[PDB]
């Protein structure tokens with residue numbers, strides 16, 4: 001995929017954001033911003049330029065399922081790739097996110113290999 005693709009990495013905790021940012025760097029993606037919750041995310045996203053979202057689930061202000069739903073419901077960004085990255089591992093949570101239009105779903109904790117496989121699975125699916 002184009003190494004200029006702009007990423008938004010959303011999570012209410014630094015540690016996770018820093019892990020993902022660094023991993024993206026390792027893969028050749030340096031165009032990366034962070035947000036701390038769904039509201040913060042939608043703000044940056046509305047400032048334009050984003051090609052990919054990676055999002056936590058449990059966050060104050062707006063959780064990741066609500067964020068995903070909002071993104072899918074906005075006509076300007078309804079096809080933005082959204083990859084969930086969360087501790088929520090119950091099948092009902094996976095179903096709910098999938099049905100809400102998640103592009104992919106990784107369960108924390110994850111390996112570097114897992115994140116790369118899943119990002120690539122999404123690239124291939126969307127012909128990126």
Ligand code: BEF
Nearest residue numbers: 056057058086087
């Ligand atoms: F807080 Be997340 F959903 F891991």
Ligand SMILES: [Cl-]
Nearest residue numbers: 104105118121
């Ligand atoms: Cl999968």
Ligand SMILES: [Mn+2]
Nearest residue numbers: 012013014015
């Ligand atoms: Mn913190």
Ligand SMILES: [Mn+2]
Nearest residue numbers: 012056058059
């Ligand atoms: Mn969280």
